[PDB]
């Protein structure tokens, strides 16, 4: 997110962070479940 002085401060709450996590985490879950 943007902090004081308009400088980025990364965090687990950044909305865009859930584009990669979703792309990576979601298959990783069901791959772990469907093929066992």
């Amino acid at each position: 997110y943007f902090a004081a002085d308009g400088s980025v401060v990364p965090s687990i709450t950044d909305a865009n962070l859930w584009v990669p996590l979703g792309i990576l985490g979601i298959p990783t879950i069901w791959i772990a479940l469907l093929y066992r």
């Binding site: 909305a15 584009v19 979703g22 792309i23 979601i26 298959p27 069901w30």
Partner: protein, 50 residues
Amino acid sequence: SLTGLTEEEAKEFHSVFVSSMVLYLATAVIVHYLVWTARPWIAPIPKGWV
């Protein structure tokens, strides 16, 4: 048969294949929504566009 698979192998493979295809398509749908939240890529019709 033509592919060497038995009927039960065909049923098992079909089940798994369809499940995987649907799961992949559904995660693609979810991912595309998330990306739209990141970047709404089909912009509205601009002012002078015809």
